[PDB]
Amino acid sequence: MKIDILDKGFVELVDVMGNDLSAVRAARVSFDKDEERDRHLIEYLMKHGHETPFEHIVFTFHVKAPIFVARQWFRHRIASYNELSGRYSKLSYEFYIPSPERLEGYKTTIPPERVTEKISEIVDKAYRTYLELIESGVPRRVARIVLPLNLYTRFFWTVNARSLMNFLNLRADSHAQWEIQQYALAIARIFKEKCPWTFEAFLKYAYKGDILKEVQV
Amino acid sequence: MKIDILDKGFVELVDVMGNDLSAVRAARVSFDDEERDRHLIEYLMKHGHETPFEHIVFTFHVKAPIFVARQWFRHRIASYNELSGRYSKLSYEFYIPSPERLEGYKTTIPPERVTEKISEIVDKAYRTYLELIESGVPRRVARIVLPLNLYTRFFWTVNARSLMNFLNLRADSHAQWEIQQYALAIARIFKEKCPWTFEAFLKYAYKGDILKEV
Amino acid sequence: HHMKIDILDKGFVELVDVMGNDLSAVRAARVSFDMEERDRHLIEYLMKHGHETPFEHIVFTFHVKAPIFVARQWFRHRIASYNELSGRYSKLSYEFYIPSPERLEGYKTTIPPERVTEKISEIVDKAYRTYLELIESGVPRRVARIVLPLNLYTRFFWTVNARSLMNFLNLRADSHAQWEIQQYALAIARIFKEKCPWTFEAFLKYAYKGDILKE
Amino acid sequence: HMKIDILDKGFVELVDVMGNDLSAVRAARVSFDEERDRHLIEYLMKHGHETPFEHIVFTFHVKAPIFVARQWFRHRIASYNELSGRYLSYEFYIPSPERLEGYKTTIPPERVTEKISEIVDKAYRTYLELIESGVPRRVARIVLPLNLYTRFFWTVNARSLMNFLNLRADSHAQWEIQQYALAIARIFKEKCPWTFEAFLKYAYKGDILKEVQV
Ligand SMILES: Cc1cc2nc3c(=O)[nH]c(=O)nc-3n(C[C@H](O)[C@H](O)[C@H](O)COP(=O)(O)OP(=O)(O)OC[C@H]3O[C@@H](n4cnc5c(N)ncnc54)[C@H](O)[C@@H]3O)c2cc1C
Numbered sequence: 001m002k003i004d005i006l007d008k009g010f011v012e013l014v015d016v017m018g019n020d021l022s023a024v025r026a027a028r029v030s031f032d033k034d035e036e037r038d039r040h041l042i043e044y045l046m047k048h049g050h051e052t053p054f055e056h057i058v059f060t061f062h063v064k065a066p067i068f069v070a071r072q073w074f075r076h077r078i079a080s081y082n083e084l085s086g087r088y089s090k091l092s093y094e095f096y097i098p099s100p101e102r103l104e105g106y107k108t109t110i111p112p113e114r115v116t117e118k119i120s121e122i123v124d125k126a127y128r129t130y131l132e133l134i135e136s137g138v139p140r141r142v143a144r145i146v147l148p149l150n151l152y153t154r155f156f157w158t159v160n161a162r163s164l165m166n167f168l169n170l171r172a173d174s175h176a177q178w179e180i181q182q183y184a185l186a187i188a189r190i191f192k193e194k195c196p197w198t199f200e201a202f203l204k205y206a207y208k209g210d211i212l213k214e215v216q217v
Numbered sequence: 218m219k220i221d222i223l224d225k226g227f228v229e230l231v232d233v234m235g236n237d238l239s240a241v242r243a244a245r246v247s248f249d250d251e252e253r254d255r256h257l258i259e260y261l262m263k264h265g266h267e268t269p270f271e272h273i274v275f276t277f278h279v280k281a282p283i284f285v286a287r288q289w290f291r292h293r294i295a296s297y298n299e300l301s302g303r304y305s306k307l308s309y310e311f312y313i314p315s316p317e318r319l320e321g322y323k324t325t326i327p328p329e330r331v332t333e334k335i336s337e338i339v340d341k342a343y344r345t346y347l348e349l350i351e352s353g354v355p356r357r358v359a360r361i362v363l364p365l366n367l368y369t370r371f372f373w374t375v376n377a378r379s380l381m382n383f384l385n386l387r388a389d390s391h392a393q394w395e396i397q398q399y400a401l402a403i404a405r406i407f408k409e410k411c412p413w414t415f416e417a418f419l420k421y422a423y424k425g426d427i428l429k430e431v
Numbered sequence: 432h433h434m435k436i437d438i439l440d441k442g443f444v445e446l447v448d449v450m451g452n453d454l455s456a457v458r459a460a461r462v463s464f465d466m467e468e469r470d471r472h473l474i475e476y477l478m479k480h481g482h483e484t485p486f487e488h489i490v491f492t493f494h495v496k497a498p499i500f501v502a503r504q505w506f507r508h509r510i511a512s513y514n515e516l517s518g519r520y521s522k523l524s525y526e527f528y529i530p531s532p533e534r535l536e537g538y539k540t541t542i543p544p545e546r547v548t549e550k551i552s553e554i555v556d557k558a559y560r561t562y563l564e565l566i567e568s569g570v571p572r573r574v575a576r577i578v579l580p581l582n583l584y585t586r587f588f589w590t591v592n593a594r595s596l597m598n599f600l601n602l603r604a605d606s607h608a609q610w611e612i613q614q615y616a617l618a619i620a621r622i623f624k625e626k627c628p629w630t631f632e633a634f635l636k637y638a639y640k641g642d643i644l645k646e
Numbered sequence: 647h648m649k650i651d652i653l654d655k656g657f658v659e660l661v662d663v664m665g666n667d668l669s670a671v672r673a674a675r676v677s678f679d680e681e682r683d684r685h686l687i688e689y690l691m692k693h694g695h696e697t698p699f700e701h702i703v704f705t706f707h708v709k710a711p712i713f714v715a716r717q718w719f720r721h722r723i724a725s726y727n728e729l730s731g732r733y734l735s736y737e738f739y740i741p742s743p744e745r746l747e748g749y750k751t752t753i754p755p756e757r758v759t760e761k762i763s764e765i766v767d768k769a770y771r772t773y774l775e776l777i778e779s780g781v782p783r784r785v786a787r788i789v790l791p792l793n794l795y796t797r798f799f800w801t802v803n804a805r806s807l808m809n810f811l812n813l814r815a816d817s818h819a820q821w822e823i824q825q826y827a828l829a830i831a832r833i834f835k836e837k838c839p840w841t842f843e844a845f846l847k848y849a850y851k852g853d854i855l856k857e858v859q860v
């Protein structure tokens with residue numbers, strides 16, 4: 001399961017431990033099936049705020065996102081992150097350039113395409129300066145500081161279903177920046193595919209945002 | 218995988234996400250060479266880059282006396298669900314130490330009389346509990362007379378980094394013997410699922426004594 | 432900063448220290464050094480819209496004496512710091528929570544509540560005397576102590592931020608919780624209200640999920 | 647408030663503190679003579695009993711470049727509130743020539759300082775054009791470079807502060823965050839001298855705080 005996001009971004013599922021029944025077994029503390037009874041229990045748990053059983057469902061995602069999105073993402077502390085660094089992995093340099101349609105709606109004094117062109121221009125210049133600095137023996141740790149906040153980074157994120165639901169409450173919401181809403185929608189889609197019963201109960205009883213009640217998946 | 222502990226306890230493995238290669242993939246941040254990969258695991262452990270190990274996760278089902286569970290639940294970086302009578306049925310079993318457990322100390326009464334005195338109190342506390350319940354005292358009030366050797370059960374979901382910290386503290390000869398025995402079983406399952414990480418842990422990061430002796 | 436509230440027969444919650452007050456959350460939210468109508472309005476705005484991170488910058492330390500059955504539930508709250516009494520550093524005393532007869536009304540028990548209290552006293556006394564005899568005989572405390580009942584009192588220090596404290600109250604200041612833990616939660620609430628009145632009142636108005644704090 | 651200037655425009659400032667060395671002593675004894683108390687601190691640190699140090703808490707106000715803030719925010723056992731724009735000002739970290747001498751480079755270090763400064767100016771001017779044109783700040787700002795300064799409040803307990811110093815007060819860390827860690831250390835040492843000295847003797851894994859005073 002890999003979903004493209006923005007112009008060069010993605011969310012890819014690496015691994016998953018458990019499913020809806022993992023929360024049911026944890027609640028009962030039994031490693032021991034009755035679909036209607038198990039679904040009823042998931043709804044009951046969610047309705048009455050017994051959220052600890054959902055901590056026993058765990059996901060690992062591989063996310064490629066711009067730094068300004070990652071910085072918001074990394075504010076979610078009840079999770080594990082490893083970000084790409086030059087020490088273990090080859091680095092590549094790509095940048096998020098908003099399309100004009102991202103920008104029309106805002107009343108601006110120049111055409112939205114001219115905005116896109118200006119952003120692409122300054123990114124091109126900053127990257128050229130960086131490469132020029134690296135070419136000259138400036139270490140990458142120093143030279144990278146000129147690079148803009150729309151630089152893509154990648155990370156692995158391991159997170160349990162409860163903390164994933166908190167992430168959606170905050171980021172799958174029209175108050176959040178549009179870019180991280182788009183990532184949260186992808187995260188929601190993957191969560192729904194793997195834990196459909198927990199996801200549906202979440203939407204019915206626990207979810208505090210707007211977008212996942214109006215946008216399917 | 219299930220390991221019996223104490224007289225009626227156990228540690229069983231419920232689920233696991235990942236293996237040694239999950240830490241390797243996380244460090245390199247890539248989803249899509251045996252010896253190079255082992256060398257990376259060792260390199261991460263010896264330099265303290267421990268975050269990649271967070272991407273290996275276990276769920277265990279543990280049955281343990283309350284005094285053991287109390288120490289275990291101090292490990293905050295993990296997830297717990299403890300048996301409740303609201304969702305499942307309760308049983309009443311108690312840990313009675315064996316007479317070998319007290320061989321070591323120069324006790325005034327034989328170790329078998331110690332075992333017997335403990336059994337005796339458990340029987341009396343349990344029968345008082347039952348008498349209160351039969352009288353109409355709610356279970357949540359009645360149960361307060363029950364002893365700390367009463368067995369409880371719990372699910373424990375924990376990542377490999379936190380599990381290592383747990384072994385550092387509990388797989389150690391200064392910890393209480395009973396929790397040592399649980400820590401040894403935890404260690405055994407960890408080793409079976411993540412042999413490379415386990416080995417690098419012992420070599421480079423483990424601070425206790427018992428895992429290098431048994 | 433010092434307050435102590437007696438709970439149960441021999442228990443208590445004592446305030447050891449506090450960092451900050453309501454304005455600490457206002458300063459955190461703005462990243463500033465403000466030190467009123469605007470400031471209250473902001474606290475209410477944060478609480479209403481669930482922006483709770485500013486409340487993490489208010490921190491309490493409590494000293495709590497509670498029975499083991501209460502402490503076990505309490506220590507389930509992971510986003511906090513605990514240090515529990517140890518014979519390694521401090522002398523140990525042996526006290527137990529005996530419920531009063533009034534605790535056992537509503538309940539239509541087949542023996543009088545006074546006799547329920549007395550039976551609990553008896554079995555506790557026998558357990559403690561067994562513990563003492565085992566200790567007297569050379570049994571280590573770590574082993575002998577396993578016969579002691581769940582109503583044995585322990586003590587601990589609890590350091591916790593206001594956000595986590597509000598989560599605590601949501602769960603424990605609730606009529607579905609055991610009456611004993613409710614009594615401890617009410618004491619925690621009491622101290623929290625006294626030190627952070629604006630946050631506490633906004634919590635009650637907008638975020639508190641329980642029933643007993645508004646009765 | 648102790649305010650320590652770091653880099654060209656940065657700082658670390660102490661907003662508040664709860665407790666001092668005696669708060670860890672109280673917590674260890676669970677109970678509300680200097681030499682006995684100092685001895686307990688050393689005993690705790692030596693034998694790994696670190697939970698008592700969780701009862702000393704600091705709140706700091708930090709102004710740092712984004713590339714430093716992003717490393718800092720990886721420390722999860724802490725509370726952060728960062729400037730956003732609807733509860734700003736625009737300064738940038740420009741490395742000094744002396745910062746860059748010591749690497750073999752093909753142009754003088756002062757040229758490098760010059761080229762960073764020029765690209766920053768261009769990115770800033772573009773950002774200002776976009777804002778003037780009606781582009782919201784939250785979109786326009788994505789052209790700004792990683793050396794833009796931000797500000798945040800950090801609340802952190804002494805145990806977690808010590809883990810932060812283990813990782814950031816070390817020569818393998820980026821020099822810029824080392825500078826910030828030295829200032830955090832100075833403030834820690836002033837408020838908690840016995841804990842700090844004990845940390846250096848028994849627990850600190852880094853190098854720089856053993857060579858560099860404060
Ligand atoms: C010799 C010795 C004697 C001890 N005696 C006692 C005693 O008398 N009383 C007592 O109560 N405890 C005592 N302990 C500690 C007790 O055993 C705890 O149960 C145990 O320390 C839990 O380990 P943890 O905090 O490392 O694990 P977790 O709670 O899982 O934490 C894992 C790691 O995360 C970090 N962490 C998590 N939460 C926080 C936080 N809130 N603040 C800062 N860092 C955090 C720490 O780095 C920690 O090591 C003693 C420990 C030792 C070694």
Ligand SMILES: Cc1cc2nc3c(=O)[nH]c(=O)nc-3n(C[C@H](O)[C@H](O)[C@H](O)COP(=O)(O)OP(=O)(O)OC[C@H]3O[C@@H](n4cnc5c(N)ncnc54)[C@H](O)[C@@H]3O)c2cc1C
Nearest residue numbers: 079082083085264265266271294378379720721722723813
């Ligand atoms: C030599 C070296 C190279 C590194 N290179 C990289 C890199 O390329 N990319 C990268 O992303 N990071 C890298 N790091 C790690 C990164 O710097 C850490 O994210 C940061 O230092 C935070 O440290 P911490 O996890 O101890 O702090 P906190 O997040 O404050 O945690 C404090 C303590 O709590 C415990 N803890 C907290 N949360 C959890 C949890 N969810 N599960 C288990 N235990 C927990 C741990 O015991 C930890 O020590 C590297 C580290 C080292 C030592």
